[PDB]
């Protein structure tokens, strides 16, 4: 159990991550090295080059034929218990919305396992425990972050039709979107247009301007078009596509990647862990305050993450049948701080961009004294 020898292995893994962040926060706030237009070029390098190449490195060295299917089915059961109690609020009550059910699912069930999670668990329980964290990253990239593009695109395509077709929208038979438009929130004018056919059935065409509900076979084609257009423009979907594809070929016929290719990838992916933390300290220096939303809600964004998160996974991991040390890994990976990728979605689409801003930043600062309190209490 907890000797003082383990407390030094945990600090060797985590103190390097805060040193990279406070030199970035110091650089803009205290010593003014970077202009705010120069910070925008460092965040754009990390988001497009360093982090997509870091997750290719982890996914392509995973063995998909030896995954731990009992550990990995207790994490899929967490996000069904959560997402099914948010369906029973939106339907029995009158004050439930759809903006709040996207926020309360991402503040409960989506932690930061790629950057903080793999170094932390591997220093606490060994090298098997940092291989279980790669298998969770495979499921977040390929399943759970694609159900949250379906929810943001359905939320945007309903604020357009119900706003411009308030008394007529039951007769729309086809919706066509022009290829110049990617996202149909309010950024462009979005001149929509209807063609009345011979029966009285409308034929909607969304154009970009210059200077009841529709049937469920019509809304389901509008969304699949627009989910597709934002999924090929995303760097983190090629990192997941080619990572799983190489991993199925390598571990069946025992093919190693050659040394020209494995060093061409590793020259930029070694820059990935250190500048993912450097870029997160440039974010907290460009916000006006750290607690950005107010004290009433910052105490609510940190109680969904560190209390409701690891309590709905104690129920899910005991029903499947995990015991011993795998139960202790699974309750400590749920108390990690808030991930970064849900913070990118809430900034683009403006759905609480401040509650998800003070959960990434203020969650990193208080996450260690809270993941160390579970580890001294589980191994009691």
């Amino acid at each position, epitope marked *: 159990m907890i000797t003082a020898a383990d407390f030094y292995h945990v600090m060797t893994a985590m103190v390097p991550l805060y040193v990279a962040m406070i030199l970035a926060y110091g650089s803009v706030k205290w010593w003014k090295i970077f202009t705010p237009d120069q910070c925008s070029g460092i965040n754009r390098f990390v988001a497009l080059f360093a982090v997509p190449l870091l997750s290719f490195h982890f996914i392509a060295a995973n063995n998909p034929y030896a995954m731990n299917l009992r550990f990995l089915a207790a994490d899929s059961l967490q996000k069904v218990i959560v997402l099914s109690l948010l369906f029973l609020w939106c339907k029995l009550s009158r004050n439930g919305s759809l903006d709040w059910t996207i926020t309360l699912f991402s503040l409960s069930t989506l932690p930061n396992t790629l950057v903080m999670g793999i170094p932390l668990l591997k220093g606490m329980y060994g090298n098997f425990s940092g291989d279980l964290m790669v298998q969770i990253v495979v499921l977040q990239c390929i399943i759970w972050y694609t159900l949250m593009l379906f929810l943001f695109e359905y939320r945007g395509a309903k604020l357009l039709i119900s706003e411009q077709f308030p008394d007529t929208a039951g007769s729309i038979v086809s919706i066509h979107v022009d290829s110049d438009i990617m996202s149909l929130d309010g950024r462009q004018p979005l001149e929509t*247009e209807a063609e009345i056919k011979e*029966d009285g059935k409308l034929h909607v065409t969304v154009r970009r301007s210059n200077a009841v509900m529709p049937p469920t076979s019509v809304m389901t084609r509008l969304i699949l078009i627009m989910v597709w257009r934002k999924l090929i423009r995303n760097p983190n979907s090629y990192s997941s596509l080619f990572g799983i594809t190489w991993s199925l070929i390598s571990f069946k016929w025992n093919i190693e990647m050659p040394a020209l290719i494995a060093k061409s990838i590793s020259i930029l992916s070694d820059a990935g862990l250190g500048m993912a933390m450097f870029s997160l300290g440039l974010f907290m220096a460009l916000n006006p305050r750290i607690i950005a939303c107010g004290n009433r809600r910052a105490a609510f964004a940190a109680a969904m993450r560190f209390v409701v998160g690891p309590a709905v996974m104690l129920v899910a991991s005991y029903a499947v049948g995990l015991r011993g040390v795998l139960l202790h890994v699974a309750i400590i990976q749920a108390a990690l701080p808030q991930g970064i990728v849900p913070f990118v979605f809430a900034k683009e689409y403006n759905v609480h961009p401040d509650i998800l801003s003070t959960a990434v930043i203020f969650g990193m600062l208080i996450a260690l004294p809270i993941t160390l309190l579970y580890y001294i209490l589980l191994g009691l």
Partner: nanobody
Amino acid sequence: SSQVQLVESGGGLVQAGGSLRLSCAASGFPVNISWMEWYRQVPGKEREWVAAIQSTGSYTWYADSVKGRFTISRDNAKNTVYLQMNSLKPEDTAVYYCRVKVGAYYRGQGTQVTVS
């Protein structure tokens, strides 16, 4: 609802240098705001807009080539506007159809605009 309908009339083959009278009889709507338009369509691309009988008749944005020569009426109780052309030039064989706004632009297709 009663199957919201647009009907258009006034097409024909005439001689260059005359006058035509188009119509756009809207029916079966909610509260209709006046932004009613007309525009041309050749078989080629890059179409352009013609007239406007917008909110209260304060400004009617005409095209640059037909400035001060097209009479556009309004009758809010009858809910039908007229596009009166004068001194028909031969380059008027496009497709003219109205674009009434009830928040989203509705239109039809049915005209026979041509001239010799």
